Structures are given as structure tokens and as C-alpha cells.
């Protein structure tokens, strides 16, 4: 579903790699993809706790590519600490060995609840939205607003929004023009790392004449 989109975006960033990320800071999913054929063992160690195993799930994708993934339980998903990962074949041969931090791979859902409204003066638009649903640390989420226009204009404005602010005021707009607004989300630094969310569902307005 929505998970497949994020997994596809990361796979193009690092082929043949063991990619981990978190959508809402309350879980963690690591996955990789390879050719066709429990032949793999996923083991992990977290901050002076005993080495545990994670149940690997296997599903096919694309042109005969098999995707293995592990979703760590919510009990072992604490952030700001090193988490060591090892994927080993049934023969004991290596496959992957990484050391990650949970807070450094955040891939948020897109913000939701967009509301665009014309201001009482021509040319200005007040845009509001909601944080990615069911996501904590909304005070630490920063956004970016995209303003597009029709007739091949493309993106005419890109405005970054501060941490925790879900409001945006846009100006310098052409009258009698259909503008379209979208916003994406990201976890601010230095506490969290990651990339932008997907663009939200858009909302459009036809500006008046001026």
C-alpha cells in the first residue's frame, strides 16, 4: 500500500543494500531485494540487550525479485541509540552487517487536511494543513509548500515552513489563475535524520481578478 511507495523510493537509492526506515518512530522495518531462490536469519542487538532474532517475511516483487523484510517489535524500537543488524544465510555465510540509529531513518507520511483560502486582499492565500497522521514529535516536523500554476507554468513557489508550524501565507500570485498547493513533511535536525515525505494531496483555488 503506502509502504510499497516508500520501499520503491529507497530501493532506487541503494540497490543490493539492506535498507531500514521508520514511518512513525514507533516501529522499524528493514528490507532488501534479490533474485529468485527460511534460508535467511535476521538477528539484531540493541544497546546492551541480548542478541535476538526477527521473523523475516518473504514476498515477490517486480520481475521475479524477492523482497525479504523484518519489522522489529514495538518493544525494541527506542531511538537515539545504536542498533546492530546481521543477516546471515542458513549456511552461516554473511549477507548483511550494519549499524544504524532508529531516529536517523525517518520517512514520514505526507501531511493531510490541506485547506487553501483566499485572503481578504487580492493576491494572498492562507494555506493550512495537518501533520502526518498518528505521528509523534509534531513539534519537530518541518514542512515545505509547493505552489504550482496551470498552462505549463509548473512550480512557481517553494516555501519552507518552520518546525511545528502547520500554516503558510502565500503572496505574489497572479489574478484569475488556478493555483495548486501541496506540502510535504520532514523531521528537523539535529535530533532526526531522513528525507522528505511524499507530497500531500493537493488543493486548488482560482484567484480573483487583480
Amino acid at each position: 500500500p503506502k509502504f510499497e511507495s516508500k520501499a520503491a523510493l529507497l530501493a532506487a537509492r541503494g540497490p543490493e543494500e539492506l535498507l531500514c526506515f521508520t514511518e512513525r518512530l514507533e516501529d522499524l522495518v528493514c528490507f532488501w531485494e534479490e533474485a529468485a531462490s527460511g534460508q535467511y536469519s535476521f538477528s539484531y542487538q540493541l544497546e546492551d540487550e541480548p542478541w535476538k532474532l526477527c521473523r523475516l517475511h518473504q514476498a515477490p516483487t517486480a520481475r521475479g525479485a524477492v523482497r525479504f523484510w523484518c519489522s522489529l517489535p514495538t518493544a525494541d524500537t527506542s531511538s537515539f541509540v545504536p542498533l546492530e543488524l546481521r543477516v546471515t544465510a542458513a549456511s552461516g555465510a554473511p549477507r548483511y552487517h550494519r549499524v544504524i540509529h532508529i531516529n536517523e531513518v525517518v520517512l514520514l507520511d505526507a501531511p493531510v487536511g490541506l485547506v487553501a483560502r483566499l485572503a481578504d486582499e487580492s493576491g494572498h492565500v492562507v494555506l493550512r494543513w495537518l501533520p502526518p497522521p498518528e505521528t509523534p514529535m509534531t513539534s519537530h516536523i518541518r514542512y515545505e509548500v509547493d505552489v504550482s500554476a496551470g498552462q505549463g507554468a509548473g512550480s512557481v513557489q517553494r516555501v519552507e515552513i518552520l518546525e511545528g508550524r502547520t500554516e503558510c501565507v502565500l503572496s505574489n500570485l497572479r489574478g484569475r489563475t488556478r493555483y495548486t498547493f501541496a506540502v510535504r513533511a520532514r523531521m528537523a535536525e539535529p535530533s532526526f535524520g531522513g528525507f522528505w515525505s511524499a507530497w500531500s494531496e493537493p488543493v486548488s483555488l482560482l484567484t480573483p481578478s487583480d
Partner: protein
Amino acid sequence: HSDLGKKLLKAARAGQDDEVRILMANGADVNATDIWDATPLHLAALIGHLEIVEVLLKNGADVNASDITGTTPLHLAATMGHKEIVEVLLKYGADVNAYDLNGATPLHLAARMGHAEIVAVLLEYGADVNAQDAAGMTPLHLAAANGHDEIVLILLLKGADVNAKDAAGMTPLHLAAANGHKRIVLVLILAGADVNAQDKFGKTAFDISIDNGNEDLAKILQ
């Protein structure tokens, strides 16, 4: 005591250069091993902490230590692409031709992951360019499969067998055509790739390019 070794393994994995020095100043085993038989030099090389790698080496770390999967610190530095750590390990006497339980050498992992500079320095320190892993794959097989153009040229120029066959009879031309790397196919063909070679299934790189549906590679291979 073993606790100082366990704390040292944690400190190295966490990239804490000051805690690493304090623990060894108190007699921590620099070659301490976890349940995977991974030394602090393994973890320091894995996370890319050149400082801790140099400190551990300066205090007598086993530069060729192997964990229960057969991987050495140079394997980890080569897969992750840590150029400076690969250099210091090598000049400390790290075995450039060590292989894990996959039969893969640090050249295999660097060529697979596309680390061009590390591929060069590994060859520069005597890496076997035609090393075969447990699947008969050579560094050129992996580089051609993953579309690393410069590494293919580097391997070929340093004596890589262009017509090497793996356990399935596939040449680098097979893998490059299977993944649609056009210029790598052009380079392999130029370097003398046997275009008529067929794997254990009886398919040439052309037959793969047709099954893939790539017209361009199909026109090249003929």
C-alpha cells in the same frame, strides 16, 4: 576482565573515541570478541570511524581478525566504501585476498557496491582480480551486473578475464545485458567478450536481451 572488553565493543560500535581510549587505558582486551567473534576493529571499520580504527591498530588490534561468518575488518571497510580505513588496514598488513564464507574477497564487495577508488587500491595492494566466490562470480561479474562502468574498465585493464563463467555458465556480458547496462556491454564486447557464449540454460546475452525486451541491446548483440 571481560566486562572491559564488552564495554570496549560497545564503545567502538558507538563511535566514542574517548571511551575507547579510557577502556584500553584500563586494560581492555583490544581483540575482545562478541558472540559473532567480531572485534572492536570490525565495528570501528563498519561504522567508518577512522580515528578509532587507528587507535585500535596502534594498541595491537588483530588487523586480520575474522568473525564466525568469515568477514574481516577490510571486508567491512570495502563494502561500506570507507576509503581511508581501507588504506590504513592494508598498510597495517590486512590480507587483501581474504575471503568470507561466500568466497568473496574485499575486491568482490567493493566491485559489487561500486566503490571505484577502493577497487583500485585493493588491486594496488595485490588483490586477485580474477578471484571467484562460492558462486563462481568474479569482481567483473559483479561490477558488470550492477552497472559500474569505471570499475569494469579498471578490472579489465588490470587483467580481468572478460569471458569468465560462474557456476551457471554466465559471463559478465550475460549479467550486464540482463540488467540493461548498454555501455558496459559495449566495453565488454570491445574487450573481447564471446557474444555467442551461452549459460547452463543455453541462452546468450542476446537471448537474454530479447527476453528482457531491450531492443537496443538486442541490436548490439548479433
